[PDB]
Amino acid sequence: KDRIEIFPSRMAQTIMKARLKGAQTGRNLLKKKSDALTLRFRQILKK
Amino acid sequence: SLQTSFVTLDEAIKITNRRVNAIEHVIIPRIERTLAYIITELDEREREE
Amino acid sequence: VCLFLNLANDPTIERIITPRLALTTAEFLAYQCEKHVLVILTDMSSYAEALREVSAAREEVPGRRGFPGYMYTDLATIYERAGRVEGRNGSITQIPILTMPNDDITHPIPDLTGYITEGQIYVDRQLHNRQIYPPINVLPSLSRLMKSAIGEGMTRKDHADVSNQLYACYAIGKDVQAMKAVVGEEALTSDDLLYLEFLQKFEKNFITQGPYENRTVYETLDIGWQLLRIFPKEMLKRIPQSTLSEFYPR
Amino acid sequence: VCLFLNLANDPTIERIITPRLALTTAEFLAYQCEKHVLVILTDMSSYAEALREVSAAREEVPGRRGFPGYMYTDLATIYERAGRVEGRNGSITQIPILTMPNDDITHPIPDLTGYITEGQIYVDRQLHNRQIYPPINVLPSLSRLMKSAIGEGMTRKDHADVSNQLYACYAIGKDVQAMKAVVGEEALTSDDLLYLEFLQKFEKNFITQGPYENRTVYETLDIGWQLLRIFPKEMLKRIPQSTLSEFYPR
Amino acid sequence: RGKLIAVIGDEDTVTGFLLGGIGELNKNRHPNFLVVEKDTTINEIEDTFRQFLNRDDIGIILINQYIAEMVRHALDAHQRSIPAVLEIPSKEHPYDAAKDSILRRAKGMF
Amino acid sequence: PGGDFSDPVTSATLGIVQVFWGLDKKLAQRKHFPSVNWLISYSKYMRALDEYYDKHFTEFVPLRTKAKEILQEEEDLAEIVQLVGKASLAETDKITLEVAKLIKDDFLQQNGYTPYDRFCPFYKTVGMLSNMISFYDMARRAVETTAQSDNKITWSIIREHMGEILYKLSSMKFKDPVKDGEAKIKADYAQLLEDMQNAFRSLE
Amino acid sequence: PGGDFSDPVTSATLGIVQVFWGLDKKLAQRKHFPSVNWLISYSKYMRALDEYYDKHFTEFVPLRTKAKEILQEEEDLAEIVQLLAETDKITLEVAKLIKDDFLQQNGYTPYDRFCPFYKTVGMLSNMISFYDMARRAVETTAITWSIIREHMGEILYKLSSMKFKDPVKDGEAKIKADYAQLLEDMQNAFRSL
């Protein structure tokens, strides 16, 4: 929804920052995977 | 062989593209909105002190 | 045109006085001369800032974001001076447009202004970036005077249900648009495509109004009915049976 | 049963001394009348609020969230009248209840009470939402003095490791539940399904007791063994093999 | 080693492919092909197509253009991978690149 | 203060009061009058009123328990269907979410300013909820048995069969009790119930 | 308070003292009393034990380095798991097993109250060797992790049960023999592959 339930504190700031960073790491990995897969798809289509 | 592998590849690519779309366009906004809320609350508490 | 001015380079603290003087003028022209007055203000954020600076100089007890505690009562003295009274044909109408920092709805000034008043408009940044005019978001806006301003004997016996149906359709259209943002058109159903097309029609035609094209109430009602005609009658869950049978088949 | 009563309509400053009276009477009924007493205290956050009100009247230096600095020592002085004494045979057990505003754990009064009291229970709202009575969250609970209060001769030969195994299994099952939420059942292995059904049975049987279901210790140990039976020998990790060979095959 | 090509088509193609070496009769004596002519009914060809789809010893099926057109609805309904389907030309129907389900799967990438 | 519920006054009023009701901004944004959250809201007086409700109406508990279960299940599956695109869902999930949508847009939605529903009596409310629960239960058992044996009843075909009936169940709130006596209302409710039964027998 | 690394007292400790012990809050709420957030943890000395190690068990030095490599590798692969392959599962499972082995949640039961350092380097060495032989894409000559998982069976169970020795009555030589049979079981189970 609009947010995740959590009581404000420095602890949640740190934890949310870490989760955020992991999320972009995953986004990069999946993006690269999909890019390679699209390249292979185009190659096989032409062939 | 080529076309069978082609259709399997199409299934895989569509599902993974859908997955990355979902995670990117769902998970992040809640995270940075909660960051905004938490920093706002901390600053308010400090100013009150 | 009773006009008053104040510029940024002028002293900040006279901004606390100016609106009160304008409101006194409105009172005099309304309840002593039997005239209608379209009072309008601008940039209440500067007023809030000046009151904040005065309060900080006077070291009162702060509140949310550091604003003064009696900012609410001050705003009440500014706004509730309006309406019309017995024995007078005059009336007071206020349009106190305000700045909205950071586009944050939970910012205190928009919040308290929403509490003290009945309605809101909330011009949208996204629509203006989409290059559409007039860019008013229809969903967050709300007016509380439908209870008596509309109805049979004033405009029609089908205004309210048309508006309710349009609001519901727009909201669900936005929701299915959000769903389509990830799911993709392939997995959708016919209803989803119908809702997307309705949303597209709603934005291209209803909202697009232009700068100098005055339109009547009847034309807007006809336009809304034409927009609604795309959906068959069955899925219209916000219209009574009688009105739906009466007006839809055209 | 001795009963000391306080309503909302009564004055507030009585609450500053109300607990101390009960504690002193408990001391007299334990260390002089030789009986076994059990004190019950209610709503310590109200005591904190009354003390904060006195501090606000007394204009001393305020600590975090406006509570006085010495409330720690005050809670110490009101939470230390416990334990049994040499040369006698009575005992004093302190069983207070306190409310956490906004379901918070880092709120001052919970934290300071955690620094005085040795243990926690943490009734949870989420369990109450699905109608599980009593909704006791075992996950953040703790009882340090279990260390030497159990074992052969006292309760049973094979007790503590059972609780530890059940506990670790519950934590990992909650992890699997979160992973299911993030991704879906498609990525789950058979082991994850086993953990999920463990979670379901654990919640259904061990947690849910009923209004007046006075269970015995041996029965609860048997129920724990029953909940362990669903897994084979290999999955369990925090259990001696000797105990497993002794009791599991039956 | 055990999997075979099944072919449904006119007489020339089946003749040349049976010459090519495909062709078996299982333990129940059922052919891996069906010859089509003018007096071949629609229900029978779609039924035998369903039967071949059910069978788990084919892998590859070949269909000439016009037969695929006459049974195009089932081919479009087909959404599997292991039972691969391809297309072949014919004597009077020269092949055209604008009619094949595999292109529908990747429509627009021409 | 700004919709935030962590304000000290809100916590105090929650701690002193016995019945708490929730208002949500998005529900009011939906024009879903009234904007009851039904998730944080709770009461502590159902137990006391159980005696009265049993003495005077003799059937409210199964209705209430099943309604709460359906609402909780829909809340659980909302973000799940959002994050899996309703692809690999069993028929049970689809019937649950769509009957939950029916309950939301008919039983919960109530425009208290239209003349026909400015006020609703208890007997009509329990009649509505009885009709809805009976529809849901009969659909559940039918789809379960048909899926088990053969010829699974998917949502699409039963929807085609009962589009007219679910339309009437949606439009049944249009009663105007001032113009409609209670006896006629309950007669129409029994009539709709036997219509639903007749359709379900027509299927099987 | 609630794992406050940013507590001013904590900053003072990090300023003055140099041996800091980690304890993750996320695991400390789970009654893992001997658990560590080793990320926030610094060793005061490394040169002190050079002369000690030259005379006693010199091979400790690289083994702990490899263990630290595992410990950070899991610290990344956990977030990879949050959102897979078998190659990462190798390190994930090794990390989980070594964590179960060393973070000894014994509840102060008497059998944990013993510290034969030389009879507690053994399981560290065994786990390190197991990882080293499993790091070559599982197949020593290169098979996925699942193959060895269902091949090992009770082997992992006994590797976990490794901790439940009572040194006071086992006898040191018998404990060395236990290490030896553990090791030969490792080599047999991997020679079968």
CSV table of N, CA and C in Angstrom, one decimal, chain C residues 35-159:
chain,number,residue,atom,x,y,z
C,35,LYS,N,-24.4,43.9,-2.1
C,35,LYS,CA,-23.6,43.5,-3.3
C,35,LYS,C,-23.0,42.2,-3.1
C,36,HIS,N,-22.8,41.4,-4.2
C,36,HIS,CA,-22.1,40.2,-4.2
C,36,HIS,C,-20.6,40.4,-4.5
C,37,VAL,N,-19.7,39.8,-3.7
C,37,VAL,CA,-18.3,40.0,-3.8
C,37,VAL,C,-17.6,38.7,-4.1
C,38,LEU,N,-16.8,38.6,-5.1
C,38,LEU,CA,-15.9,37.5,-5.4
C,38,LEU,C,-14.5,37.7,-4.8
C,39,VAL,N,-14.4,37.5,-3.5
C,39,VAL,CA,-13.1,37.7,-2.8
C,39,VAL,C,-12.2,36.5,-3.3
C,40,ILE,N,-11.0,36.9,-3.6
C,40,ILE,CA,-10.0,35.9,-4.0
C,40,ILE,C,-8.6,36.4,-3.4
C,41,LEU,N,-7.8,35.4,-2.9
C,41,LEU,CA,-6.5,35.7,-2.3
C,41,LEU,C,-5.5,34.9,-3.1
C,42,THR,N,-4.2,35.0,-2.6
C,42,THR,CA,-3.2,34.2,-3.3
C,42,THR,C,-2.0,34.0,-2.3
C,43,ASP,N,-1.4,32.9,-2.5
C,43,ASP,CA,-0.1,32.7,-1.8
C,43,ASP,C,-0.2,32.7,-0.3
C,44,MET,N,-1.0,31.9,0.3
C,44,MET,CA,-1.2,31.8,1.7
C,44,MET,C,0.1,31.3,2.4
C,45,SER,N,1.0,30.7,1.6
C,45,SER,CA,2.2,30.1,2.2
C,45,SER,C,3.1,31.3,2.8
C,46,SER,N,3.1,32.4,2.0
C,46,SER,CA,3.8,33.5,2.6
C,46,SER,C,3.2,34.1,3.8
C,47,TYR,N,1.9,34.0,3.9
C,47,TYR,CA,1.2,34.4,5.2
C,47,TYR,C,1.6,33.5,6.3
C,48,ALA,N,1.6,32.2,6.0
C,48,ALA,CA,2.0,31.2,7.1
C,48,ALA,C,3.4,31.5,7.5
C,49,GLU,N,4.3,31.8,6.5
C,49,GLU,CA,5.7,32.0,6.8
C,49,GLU,C,5.9,33.2,7.7
C,50,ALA,N,5.2,34.3,7.4
C,50,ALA,CA,5.3,35.5,8.2
C,50,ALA,C,4.7,35.3,9.6
C,51,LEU,N,3.6,34.6,9.7
C,51,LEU,CA,3.1,34.3,11.1
C,51,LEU,C,4.1,33.4,11.8
C,52,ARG,N,4.7,32.5,11.1
C,52,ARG,CA,5.8,31.6,11.7
C,52,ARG,C,6.9,32.4,12.2
C,53,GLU,N,7.4,33.4,11.5
C,53,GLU,CA,8.5,34.2,11.9
C,53,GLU,C,8.1,35.1,13.1
C,54,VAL,N,6.9,35.6,13.1
C,54,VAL,CA,6.4,36.4,14.3
C,54,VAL,C,6.4,35.5,15.5
C,55,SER,N,5.8,34.3,15.4
C,55,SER,CA,5.7,33.3,16.5
C,55,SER,C,7.1,33.0,17.0
C,56,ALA,N,8.1,32.7,16.1
C,56,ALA,CA,9.4,32.4,16.5
C,56,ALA,C,10.1,33.5,17.2
C,57,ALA,N,9.8,34.8,16.8
C,57,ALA,CA,10.3,35.9,17.5
C,57,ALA,C,9.7,36.0,18.9
C,58,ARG,N,8.4,35.5,19.1
C,58,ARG,CA,7.7,35.5,20.3
C,58,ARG,C,7.8,34.2,21.1
C,59,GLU,N,8.6,33.3,20.6
C,59,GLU,CA,8.9,32.0,21.3
C,59,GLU,C,7.7,31.3,21.9
C,60,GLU,N,6.7,31.2,21.1
C,60,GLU,CA,5.5,30.4,21.6
C,60,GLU,C,5.8,28.9,21.5
C,61,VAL,N,4.9,28.1,21.9
C,61,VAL,CA,5.0,26.6,21.9
C,61,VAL,C,4.8,26.2,20.4
C,62,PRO,N,5.8,25.5,19.8
C,62,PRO,CA,5.6,25.1,18.4
C,62,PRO,C,4.7,23.9,18.3
C,63,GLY,N,4.5,23.5,17.0
C,63,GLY,CA,3.6,22.4,16.7
C,63,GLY,C,4.3,21.5,15.6
C,64,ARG,N,3.5,21.1,14.6
C,64,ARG,CA,4.0,20.2,13.6
C,64,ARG,C,4.8,21.0,12.6
C,65,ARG,N,6.0,20.5,12.3
C,65,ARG,CA,7.0,21.2,11.4
C,65,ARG,C,7.5,22.5,12.0
C,66,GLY,N,7.1,22.8,13.3
C,66,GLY,CA,7.5,24.1,13.9
C,66,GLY,C,6.6,25.2,13.7
C,67,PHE,N,5.4,25.0,13.2
C,67,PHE,CA,4.4,26.0,13.0
C,67,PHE,C,3.8,26.5,14.3
C,68,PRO,N,3.2,27.7,14.3
C,68,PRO,CA,2.6,28.1,15.6
C,68,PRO,C,1.3,27.3,15.9
C,69,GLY,N,1.0,27.3,17.2
C,69,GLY,CA,-0.2,26.5,17.6
C,69,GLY,C,-1.5,27.2,17.2
C,70,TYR,N,-1.5,28.5,17.2
C,70,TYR,CA,-2.7,29.3,16.9
C,70,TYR,C,-2.8,29.7,15.5
C,71,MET,N,-2.0,29.1,14.6
C,71,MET,CA,-2.1,29.2,13.2
C,71,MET,C,-3.5,28.8,12.7
C,72,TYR,N,-4.0,27.7,13.4
C,72,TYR,CA,-5.4,27.3,13.0
C,72,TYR,C,-6.4,28.3,13.3
C,73,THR,N,-6.4,28.9,14.5
C,73,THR,CA,-7.4,29.9,14.9
C,73,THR,C,-7.2,31.1,14.0
C,74,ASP,N,-6.0,31.5,13.7
C,74,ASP,CA,-5.8,32.6,12.8
C,74,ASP,C,-6.4,32.3,11.5
C,75,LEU,N,-6.2,31.2,10.9
C,75,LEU,CA,-6.8,30.8,9.6
C,75,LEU,C,-8.3,30.8,9.7
C,76,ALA,N,-8.8,30.4,10.9
C,76,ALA,CA,-10.3,30.4,11.1
C,76,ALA,C,-10.8,31.8,11.0
C,77,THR,N,-10.1,32.8,11.6
C,77,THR,CA,-10.5,34.2,11.6
C,77,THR,C,-10.4,34.7,10.1
C,78,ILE,N,-9.5,34.2,9.4
C,78,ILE,CA,-9.4,34.6,8.0
C,78,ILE,C,-10.5,34.0,7.1
C,79,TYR,N,-10.9,32.8,7.2
C,79,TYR,CA,-11.7,32.1,6.3
C,79,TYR,C,-13.2,32.1,6.7
C,80,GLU,N,-13.6,31.8,7.9
C,80,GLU,CA,-15.0,31.7,8.3
C,80,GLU,C,-15.8,33.0,8.1
C,81,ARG,N,-15.1,34.1,7.9
C,81,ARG,CA,-15.8,35.4,7.6
C,81,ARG,C,-16.3,35.3,6.1
C,82,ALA,N,-17.4,34.7,6.0
C,82,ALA,CA,-18.0,34.5,4.6
C,82,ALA,C,-19.5,34.1,4.8
C,83,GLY,N,-20.1,33.7,3.7
C,83,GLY,CA,-21.5,33.3,3.7
C,83,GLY,C,-22.4,34.5,3.5
C,84,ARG,N,-23.7,34.2,3.6
C,84,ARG,CA,-24.8,35.2,3.5
C,84,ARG,C,-25.7,35.0,4.7
C,85,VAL,N,-26.4,36.1,5.1
C,85,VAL,CA,-27.2,36.1,6.3
C,85,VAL,C,-28.6,36.5,6.0
C,86,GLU,N,-29.5,36.4,7.0
C,86,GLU,CA,-30.9,36.7,6.8
C,86,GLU,C,-31.0,38.2,6.6
C,87,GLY,N,-32.0,38.6,5.8
C,87,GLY,CA,-32.3,40.0,5.6
C,87,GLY,C,-31.4,40.6,4.5
C,88,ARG,N,-30.5,39.9,4.0
C,88,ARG,CA,-29.6,40.4,3.0
C,88,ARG,C,-29.5,39.5,1.8
C,89,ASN,N,-29.5,40.1,0.6
C,89,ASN,CA,-29.4,39.4,-0.6
C,89,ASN,C,-27.9,39.2,-1.1
C,90,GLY,N,-27.0,39.8,-0.4
C,90,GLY,CA,-25.6,39.7,-0.7
C,90,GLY,C,-25.0,38.4,-0.2
C,91,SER,N,-23.8,38.2,-0.6
C,91,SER,CA,-23.1,36.9,-0.3
C,91,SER,C,-21.6,37.1,-0.4
C,92,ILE,N,-20.8,36.2,0.2
C,92,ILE,CA,-19.4,36.2,0.3
C,92,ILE,C,-18.9,34.9,-0.3
C,93,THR,N,-18.0,35.0,-1.3
C,93,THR,CA,-17.4,33.8,-1.9
C,93,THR,C,-15.9,34.0,-1.9
C,94,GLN,N,-15.2,33.0,-1.4
C,94,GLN,CA,-13.7,33.0,-1.2
C,94,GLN,C,-13.1,32.0,-2.1
C,95,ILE,N,-11.9,32.4,-2.7
C,95,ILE,CA,-11.1,31.5,-3.5
C,95,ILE,C,-9.7,31.7,-3.0
C,96,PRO,N,-9.3,31.3,-1.8
C,96,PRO,CA,-7.9,31.5,-1.3
C,96,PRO,C,-6.9,30.5,-1.8
C,97,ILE,N,-6.4,30.7,-3.0
C,97,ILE,CA,-5.4,29.8,-3.6
C,97,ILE,C,-4.2,29.9,-2.8
C,98,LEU,N,-3.4,28.8,-2.7
C,98,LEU,CA,-2.3,28.7,-1.8
C,98,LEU,C,-1.2,27.9,-2.5
C,99,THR,N,0.1,28.1,-2.1
C,99,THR,CA,1.2,27.4,-2.6
C,99,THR,C,1.3,26.1,-1.8
C,100,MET,N,1.8,25.0,-2.4
C,100,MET,CA,1.8,23.7,-1.8
C,100,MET,C,3.3,23.2,-1.9
C,101,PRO,N,4.1,23.4,-0.9
C,101,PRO,CA,5.5,23.1,-1.0
C,101,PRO,C,5.7,21.6,-1.1
C,102,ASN,N,6.6,21.2,-2.1
C,102,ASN,CA,7.1,19.8,-2.3
C,102,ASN,C,6.0,18.9,-2.7
C,103,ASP,N,4.8,19.4,-3.1
C,103,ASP,CA,3.7,18.6,-3.6
C,103,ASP,C,3.3,17.5,-2.6
C,104,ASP,N,3.4,17.8,-1.3
C,104,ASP,CA,3.2,16.9,-0.2
C,104,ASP,C,1.8,17.2,0.4
C,105,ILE,N,0.9,16.2,0.3
C,105,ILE,CA,-0.5,16.5,0.9
C,105,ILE,C,-0.5,16.5,2.4
C,106,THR,N,0.4,15.8,3.1
C,106,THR,CA,0.5,15.8,4.5
C,106,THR,C,1.2,17.0,5.1
C,107,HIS,N,1.7,18.0,4.2
C,107,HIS,CA,2.3,19.2,4.7
C,107,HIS,C,1.2,19.9,5.5
C,108,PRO,N,1.6,20.5,6.7
C,108,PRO,CA,0.6,21.1,7.6
C,108,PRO,C,-0.3,22.1,6.9
C,109,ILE,N,0.2,23.1,6.1
C,109,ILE,CA,-0.6,24.1,5.6
C,109,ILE,C,-1.8,23.6,4.7
C,110,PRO,N,-1.5,22.7,3.7
C,110,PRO,CA,-2.7,22.1,3.0
C,110,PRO,C,-3.6,21.3,4.0
C,111,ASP,N,-3.1,20.6,4.9
C,111,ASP,CA,-3.9,19.9,5.8
C,111,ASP,C,-4.9,20.8,6.6
C,112,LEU,N,-4.4,21.8,7.3
C,112,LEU,CA,-5.2,22.6,8.1
C,112,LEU,C,-6.2,23.4,7.2
C,113,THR,N,-5.7,23.8,6.0
C,113,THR,CA,-6.6,24.5,5.1
C,113,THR,C,-7.8,23.6,4.7
C,114,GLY,N,-7.5,22.3,4.5
C,114,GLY,CA,-8.5,21.4,4.2
C,114,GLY,C,-9.5,21.2,5.3
C,115,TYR,N,-9.0,21.1,6.5
C,115,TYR,CA,-9.9,21.0,7.7
C,115,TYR,C,-10.8,22.2,7.8
C,116,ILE,N,-10.3,23.4,7.7
C,116,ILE,CA,-11.1,24.6,8.0
C,116,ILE,C,-12.1,24.8,6.8
C,117,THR,N,-11.9,24.3,5.6
C,117,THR,CA,-12.8,24.6,4.5
C,117,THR,C,-13.6,23.3,4.2
C,118,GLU,N,-14.5,23.4,3.2
C,118,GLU,CA,-15.3,22.3,2.7
C,118,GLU,C,-14.6,21.6,1.5
C,119,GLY,N,-14.1,22.4,0.5
C,119,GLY,CA,-13.7,21.8,-0.8
C,119,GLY,C,-12.3,22.1,-1.2
C,120,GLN,N,-11.9,21.5,-2.3
C,120,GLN,CA,-10.6,21.6,-2.8
C,120,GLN,C,-10.6,21.3,-4.3
C,121,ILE,N,-9.5,21.7,-5.0
C,121,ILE,CA,-9.4,21.5,-6.4
C,121,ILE,C,-8.1,20.7,-6.8
C,122,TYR,N,-7.0,21.1,-6.3
C,122,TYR,CA,-5.7,20.4,-6.4
C,122,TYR,C,-5.3,20.2,-7.9
C,123,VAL,N,-5.0,21.4,-8.5
C,123,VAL,CA,-4.3,21.4,-9.8
C,123,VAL,C,-3.1,20.4,-9.8
C,124,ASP,N,-2.9,19.7,-10.9
C,124,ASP,CA,-1.9,18.6,-10.9
C,124,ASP,C,-0.7,19.0,-11.7
C,125,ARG,N,0.5,18.5,-11.2
C,125,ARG,CA,1.7,18.7,-11.9
C,125,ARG,C,1.9,17.7,-13.0
C,126,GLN,N,1.4,16.5,-12.8
C,126,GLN,CA,1.5,15.4,-13.8
C,126,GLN,C,0.8,15.8,-15.1
C,127,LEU,N,-0.4,16.3,-14.9
C,127,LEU,CA,-1.2,16.7,-16.1
C,127,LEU,C,-0.6,17.9,-16.8
C,128,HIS,N,0.0,18.8,-16.1
C,128,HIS,CA,0.6,19.9,-16.8
C,128,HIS,C,1.9,19.5,-17.5
C,129,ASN,N,2.6,18.4,-17.0
C,129,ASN,CA,3.7,17.8,-17.7
C,129,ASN,C,3.2,17.0,-18.8
C,130,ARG,N,2.0,16.5,-18.8
C,130,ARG,CA,1.4,15.9,-20.0
C,130,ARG,C,0.9,16.9,-21.0
C,131,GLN,N,1.0,18.2,-20.8
C,131,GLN,CA,0.6,19.2,-21.7
C,131,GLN,C,-0.9,19.1,-22.0
C,132,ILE,N,-1.7,19.3,-21.0
C,132,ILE,CA,-3.1,19.3,-21.1
C,132,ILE,C,-3.6,20.5,-20.2
C,133,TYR,N,-4.6,21.2,-20.7
C,133,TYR,CA,-5.2,22.3,-20.0
C,133,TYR,C,-6.7,22.2,-20.2
C,134,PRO,N,-7.5,22.6,-19.1
C,134,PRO,CA,-7.1,23.0,-17.7
C,134,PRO,C,-6.6,21.7,-17.0
C,135,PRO,N,-5.5,21.7,-16.3
C,135,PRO,CA,-5.0,20.5,-15.7
C,135,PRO,C,-5.4,20.4,-14.2
C,136,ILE,N,-6.7,20.0,-14.0
C,136,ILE,CA,-7.3,19.8,-12.7
C,136,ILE,C,-7.5,18.3,-12.5
C,137,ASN,N,-6.8,17.7,-11.6
C,137,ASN,CA,-7.1,16.3,-11.2
C,137,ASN,C,-8.5,16.2,-10.6
C,138,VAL,N,-9.3,15.3,-11.2
C,138,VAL,CA,-10.7,15.3,-10.8
C,138,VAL,C,-10.9,14.4,-9.6
C,139,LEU,N,-10.0,13.4,-9.3
C,139,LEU,CA,-10.2,12.5,-8.2
C,139,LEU,C,-10.0,13.1,-6.9
C,140,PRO,N,-8.8,13.7,-6.6
C,140,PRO,CA,-8.6,14.2,-5.2
C,140,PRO,C,-9.5,15.4,-4.9
C,141,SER,N,-10.1,16.1,-5.9
C,141,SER,CA,-11.0,17.2,-5.6
C,141,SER,C,-12.3,16.7,-5.0
C,142,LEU,N,-12.9,17.6,-4.3
C,142,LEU,CA,-14.2,17.3,-3.6
C,142,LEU,C,-14.9,18.6,-3.3
C,143,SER,N,-16.2,18.6,-3.5
C,143,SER,CA,-17.0,19.7,-3.0
C,143,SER,C,-18.2,19.1,-2.2
C,144,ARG,N,-18.5,19.8,-1.1
C,144,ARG,CA,-19.4,19.3,-0.1
C,144,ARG,C,-20.8,19.9,-0.3
C,145,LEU,N,-21.0,20.8,-1.3
C,145,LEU,CA,-22.3,21.5,-1.5
C,145,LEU,C,-23.2,20.8,-2.5
C,146,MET,N,-22.8,19.6,-3.0
C,146,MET,CA,-23.7,18.8,-3.8
C,146,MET,C,-25.0,18.5,-3.1
C,147,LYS,N,-25.0,18.5,-1.7
C,147,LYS,CA,-26.1,18.1,-0.9
C,147,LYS,C,-27.4,19.0,-1.2
C,148,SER,N,-27.2,20.2,-1.5
C,148,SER,CA,-28.3,21.1,-1.9
C,148,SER,C,-28.1,21.9,-3.2
C,149,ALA,N,-26.9,22.1,-3.6
C,149,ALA,CA,-26.7,22.9,-4.8
C,149,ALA,C,-27.3,22.3,-6.1
C,150,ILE,N,-27.3,20.9,-6.1
C,150,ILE,CA,-27.8,20.2,-7.3
C,150,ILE,C,-29.1,19.5,-6.9
C,151,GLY,N,-29.7,18.8,-7.9
C,151,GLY,CA,-31.0,18.1,-7.7
C,151,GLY,C,-32.1,18.6,-8.6
C,152,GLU,N,-33.2,17.9,-8.5
C,152,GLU,CA,-34.4,18.3,-9.3
C,152,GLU,C,-34.9,19.7,-8.9
C,153,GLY,N,-35.3,20.4,-9.9
C,153,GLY,CA,-35.8,21.8,-9.7
C,153,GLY,C,-34.7,22.8,-9.8
C,154,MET,N,-33.4,22.4,-9.9
C,154,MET,CA,-32.3,23.3,-10.1
C,154,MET,C,-31.6,23.0,-11.4
C,155,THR,N,-31.0,21.8,-11.5
C,155,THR,CA,-30.4,21.4,-12.8
C,155,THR,C,-31.1,20.2,-13.4
C,156,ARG,N,-31.3,19.1,-12.7
C,156,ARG,CA,-31.8,17.9,-13.3
C,156,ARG,C,-32.0,16.8,-12.2
C,157,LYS,N,-32.7,15.7,-12.6
C,157,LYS,CA,-32.8,14.6,-11.7
C,157,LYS,C,-31.8,13.5,-11.9
C,158,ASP,N,-30.8,13.7,-12.7
C,158,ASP,CA,-29.7,12.7,-13.0
C,158,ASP,C,-28.3,13.3,-12.9
C,159,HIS,N,-28.1,14.4,-12.3
C,159,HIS,CA,-26.8,15.0,-12.2
C,159,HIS,C,-25.9,14.2,-11.2
